[model samples]
Target chain A: SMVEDHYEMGEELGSGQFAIVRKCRQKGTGKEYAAKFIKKRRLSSSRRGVSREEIEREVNILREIRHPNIITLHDIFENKTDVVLILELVSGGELFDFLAEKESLTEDEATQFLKQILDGVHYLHSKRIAHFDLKPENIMLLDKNVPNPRIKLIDFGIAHKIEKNIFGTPEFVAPEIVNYEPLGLEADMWSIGVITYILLSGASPFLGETKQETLTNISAVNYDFDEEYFSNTSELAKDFIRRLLVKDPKRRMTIAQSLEHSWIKA
Target chain B: VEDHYEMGEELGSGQFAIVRKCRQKGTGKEYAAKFIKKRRLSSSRRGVSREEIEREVNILREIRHPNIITLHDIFENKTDVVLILELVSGGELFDFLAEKESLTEDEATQFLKQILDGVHYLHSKRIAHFDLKPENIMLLDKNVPNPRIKLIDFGIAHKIEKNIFGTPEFVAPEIVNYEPLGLEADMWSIGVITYILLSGASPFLGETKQETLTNISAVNYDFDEEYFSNTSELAKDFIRRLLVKDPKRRMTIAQSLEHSWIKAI
Candidate 1:
């Protein structure tokens, strides 16, 4: 009812396999919002059981989790063929693009961004949700025009109640996801480790030349702090990364433990 | 719309509106939401007119540039009209100037040049920002090496016309004499601001508001030796060219941008 009277649809922001995000403004207020239109007809035909449940679960999880760093899910509208998710319009763009523009960052600068991600991830784990997809692309800066903009964790497309089934990107994917193990909140933490490494060095730790090689590197949990890059980096930061990138999920640092680590605590 | 914004701390307040830091409900993006009390407008005798409010919004929506604070959105509720503006965390230029010891000529020139670029763009659009002072200029980020500025608070801004409106210290002589006002009035304010930026002193301020008006009317101010002893002659020349009593003689925005002082940097 509110959407019918209040919203005037604008340009398309982005699109995915079965969804398209568009800019929308409140009719009288002119407040901007990103409307994610999920085509139900495509989901019913292609995704079947997993698609419907996944969409519902994402909406439910987003509605439940309310933290400063996590993306907010404002309202939802549905019709016969589509489900329009009215979300926050993050104008600062993607974290990947922000980092790509700069050569690299100091530990202090990277830590500021990492801490916000940890805070958001910690909040999600605390709420019994595991954001299966956590990477630079999923992270957004609140205002790119500023020097040190705030970060927001977004795109809970494949997120679930502390579980996963190999549904994340290659370089940042956790070992558990690669090995077909029961996924937990540690997967997100592992991605945070990869994100932190790239933030400080501007190089991906586990990425290989080919997709197969990249997956193989993840399968073996193969990564290291090369002296060329890590000479200036502190031991505490390397240790922080080492603790989270463990091959065994059970040995990996929990969200709580990672937050309390000396590197993040500093 | 109320449920869409999770209100944060109050950023500022005016007579009829209270601005608060707010996050978009879904995106967690930051914005300054000015909740204007609608009922207060109807109740008060001197309250701003609805047309005046619409004019401000219309002007903000029309102008789009890097140096101007953006008008993101506008919302009307049962009791209030909320204006969603870009959230600029870097404090006011007034506070920035007060905090620093004194700006170097290069820094002052940088600030003034940016302001001029913004003003020049507005003039080209036929809009005269009647209010142009340090407080109206905002830094995009204070921590950066060369922090960018965004001109804000367009409450008294509109197309070029005669109007007896503006802050006392920054008011042009034409407004005081009830003469036809134009973009030149803005140039006079720029002169005063430029003088303050260089000398850290108000050139026109006297013992009282009446005296301040008299100094402005008579164009009665000078670069006192105590303040301008270290300032460059080119800087003083720029101010003298702008602070003239005759609007016709004052430096236009284009001319001010081309001055040797501005061109030096």
Candidate 2:
């Protein structure tokens, strides 16, 4: 039987501007998977059509990247109204769920999880590729019980090879990049810092629900950790996160330097 | 592991590992890959095992900072664990500064921020980078007008005890005395680095490692009156906090971050 002929489709997993992920299964393997179907018309309106280019780019880039932490692109097929992508099924759901549910992890547990994340990121940087789209929603896990929990870096729409472009979610993009300046691996460093802060604080650095407000703060490099975040988290962790989230991109820590940090080594 | 790629000019080497210029098969991206051979634990000693290597690999796998050299991949072809790393073009910080008589205060502050930012994130994850020095710092684009530093090498860098592991000239005094170290040790080295940037000299230098350690312990150092007396007080004060002989009272990364000197930059 064909992939389309697999088990009957289950409930909708989620919906984005251009695509929807639905629960499905392989007929012979009986393996469950998430089927991402992207409608053609949705691509044009999902921002500036950059989303369409990002999806098309992933189809090519994923073939070269095969890291355990990154989301695996199993297959892709397109029809008249839809472009379908087969992704590794992760049951732990979005990272936001875990962040909202657990409040925060113990120092040791955060260290383990962070190590796993860095390993995957190191692999991508070595290849000279930037996942430009790093965020809690993009990071998904296989399940809570999975040892080291398999982290899949998903959503390649904004992901691209280190190129000259101001492309990425406004809240996550580095300040320099927002000004249409040339960006290096430090852009990813910014996102990772944001993710770490959100995971620990259970709050966004620049907390304005409005997209414009968030973008304004992000572009201005305006952010600070209140006493609640620093006092609750280890001092070492707070210091490290603050370093990564520095407003000065030139001073931002590179992936290699971050790994050498005493906090990460601990 | 079989020596598939020919090791070229020794870029760097330590007790457990050696980094050599090597080339990949198809991509041809020049890399200075470090080859770490597994050492057997002595029958009388309990040391790192194969499982420990896995743990280190897992940690390296998760890290992804830009100022930090990228760990391309890790695979055991045979008996050796090969970590293909980024080939920073500008060589080490020592080499770069050696070529130049000295770095301007502005240049030093800029580079220091990059280093701290990288170190800060690692610390945030509860990882303390023990080896912080000029030798391990690499420059990726020397030809560019303003060269930037890239942190590299991790064979001896482990997530344990957070002890000191750097050149004797840059090591903290407490670290030399076998005292438990924390984030302040890095601040000490940064102070030393700042001193070097200002006065073309090492803060604690001697003929041998023991002598160097002794100098660091005694804090027997001087700032050239002709060279440093005329320098900005903020610069001198920053160094004083970092080289505070007493690690317990040393300035923190956060405090250092707010230094009036760096802020002037």
Q: What is the lDDT of residue B47 in candidate 1?
A: 44
Q: Tell me the tens digit of each residue's lDDT in model 2 across B1-265.
A: 1244545677776545677888776666677777676635311122233434554664566578878877776667554667777788887766766777656667677777787777766665555554566666778987788777787655434443311111222111121233334555566766776776677677777786556656676666778786686467888898888777676787877777788877676
- What's the residue-level lDDT of B259 in candidate 1? 90
Please, what are the lDDT tens digits per residue for candidate 1 over residues B1-265? 5688888899988747899999898888999998876534222334444545665776787778889989887898777778999999888776776778666888778888889999999998778887677777899888788878899888767765311111111111211223335788788888888888888788877786555655676677888899999899999999999888777888999999889888888
Compose the digit string of candidate 2's lDDT tens values, residues A16-72: 546789988766777777888877644225233223334555665676677988877
* Per-model TM values vs. the true structure: 0.46, 0.43
Report fnat in order of the candidates: 0.00, 0.00
Which CAPRI tier for candidate 1?
incorrect
TM-score of chain B of 1: 0.88
